[model samples]
Target: MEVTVPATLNVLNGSDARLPCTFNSCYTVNHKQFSLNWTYQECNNCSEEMFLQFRMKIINLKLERFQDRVEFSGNPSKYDVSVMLRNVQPEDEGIYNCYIMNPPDRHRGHGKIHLQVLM
Candidate 1:
């Protein structure tokens, strides 16, 4: 499995940001057991935590900081698991992980996007 994402994203403060993610897997996306997770790390070497998750066709926002400020903007059936950040603030600068797990693929697909919030 191979995941693709931009190495860096430059977003003006208070503007919406699109974090694009796409993946290629050994298996098809028709499997219902597949899962998509979006995690964030505020700083280098910091522990990443899941902020959004998609499993069994259900979407869940795990972090209150992102609730109402995040959107699932990608379709799994199309091999995309991207997301959008609404009105991103300076505090939103960090690394975002786009993780994809498709059963029978042996390895999970992972990609990272470093978001830099600017004035």
Candidate 2:
């Protein structure tokens, strides 16, 4: 399987930002067989925050200063793992990544994108 991502994303403050991720896989996306994950590196301190996860369902890990600011959308079956940032702010600028794990075929891959917040 291969993961793809945009080189960068930009969004006007007060709006939503779309940082997309795509996967090209030969295997079906079965919750019981694999998992999808997302994480981000904040500009400050740049820690890897576990942003979201999907197996049987979506699980979002809330972060300080980011409550209700993050959201997800995309179809696992269709190989889309896109996410949204609601009411995006300048401080939200960062780099984001997508990853998937399928034990079968020894699939483990990642893609990343940079985000720039603007006025």
Candidate 3:
């Protein structure tokens, strides 16, 4: 029903960190009419939006502020929504939110990730 990343993570400045998100159940025919959307809200309040309006596929990383340093992976069929951040920087320290939106009426499931970047 909802997706979430781990509670806490610590990583070196030049390496990669993985943030995981998942939906517990598979989509049945009853759930087929819905869609999934993934978004990232940066510490600065800027939001990165991805995938489409009604898609079950994983959203590709958009080339933006953290694009070159960030990667995303997961199987939507299993509701796995994970992200990898490479060459992490101090500016990358913050809370990240993963959300799933079902349309017609926007019902949502959400999770938060806390990242601590080290030198």
Candidate 4:
């Protein structure tokens, strides 16, 4: 499987940001058989923080700063695993990682998007 995402995304502060992450797999998508995670980091080599997760179901948001500010906008069956970040703040500028694992496929899919919040 392979994951894809834009290299960079720019959004105005206070506006919503859409992180479009896509994946391709040889095996069919069985929600129960696949899992995905999204993480955020402020800088290169920084310790990433998990902000979203999906297994059989979506886990609670891990970062308090992003609580109630994130929405999953992609359908797993459609190979889209994008997320929407609402009212993005300057502090939200960071590197976002999208990781997807489809069991039938040995290799996992991983992609990264750099989010830039403009004034």
Candidate 5:
């Protein structure tokens, strides 16, 4: 599946930021087993910060350091998996990953949002 993500998103410090992400595919979205994964990693780093998982209508998982900041703003029926950051900070600038998965196990192209936080 392919995802639509911006090359960069500018956010003012202490303000809210929204990272645009959407999974695109001809496959049906009503499938219950399909999963949406969002991950974050410091630029040029190997370790990644787990964000949130959107399944059905609930957020199934949220990692620490992000639980109080990240929000799942996607609608499964509409094929949206966007994320919003609360009180945007300078250190929050990083590469964000938006991955999509289904029973067939497939991925294509690239889907990542590079955030730029300005003070």
Candidate 6:
């Protein structure tokens, strides 16, 4: 799977923004028993860390720094999971992960989205 955006963005200090993450795959509908998870990783020169997480459900949306500014949209029937991050902030930039995990008896697929917050 792969995640894509319309184009790189440059946001002002306090502008509202939306960063899109699109997913694609060749898996069949028979594989609908899996769970999809989206994660953001923060890398600072050396080590990396998880920043935010989205579990593809309204209940699993994490309420953190930018949680209120984030939202997700996609058709699970079509295997397209995309995320929208509103109210862009410099601290809200990082590498995001889009992962699909099936049971141990099934197949799993994963993808990533790299976001940059330019001043």
How well does each candidate superpose onto the true structure, as a TM-score? 0.91, 0.89, 0.68, 0.94, 0.83, 0.63
Candidate 2 ranges beyond 4 A from true positions: 43-45
Per-model CA lDDT versus the true structure: 0.83, 0.79, 0.62, 0.87, 0.74, 0.56
RMSD of 3: 3.9
- Among these predictions, the greatest TM-score belongs to 4
**Lowest summed lDDT over 10 consecutive residues: which window, candidate 2?**
42-51
lDDT of 1 by residue, 2-36 (tens): 77789999999999999999998756787478888
Question: Model 5 — TM-score against the truth?
Answer: 0.83
Question: Per-residue lDDT of 1-119 in model 2, one digit per residue for the tens?
Answer: 67778887778989988777888877777777668778888753577788688877888887786787888878777878788778888877898878888667576778888889888
Superior by TM-score: candidate 2 or candidate 3? 2
Candidate 6 lDDT trough over 10 residues, lowest sum: 44-53
Models, CA RMSD each: 1.4, 1.9, 3.9, 1.1, 2.2, 4.1
**Clash pairs for candidate 1:** none
Enumerate residue pairs that collide in model 6: none
Name the lDDT value of residue 18 in candidate 1.
93
Query: Candidate 2: deviation at residue 60, Å?
Result: 1.1
What would the per-residue lDDT of candidate 3 be over residues 19-109, giving only the tens digit for each residue? 7767664443224554555455555366654522235443454556575666666554556667667788887777767776544444477
Candidates arranged by lDDT, highest first = 4, 1, 2, 5, 3, 6
What global local distance difference test value does model 5 have? Answer: 0.74
Candidate 4 lDDT, 23-118, residue by residue in tens? 888779898778998888988799999878998977757478786888888898998989878889888999999888888788868899999999
| TM-score of structure candidate 2 | 0.89
Off by over 4 Å in 6: 1-32, 44-57, 102-105
The all-Cα superposition gives candidate 2 an RMSD in Å to the true structure of 1.9
Cα deviation in Å at residue 2, candidate 3? 4.0
Best by lDDT: 4
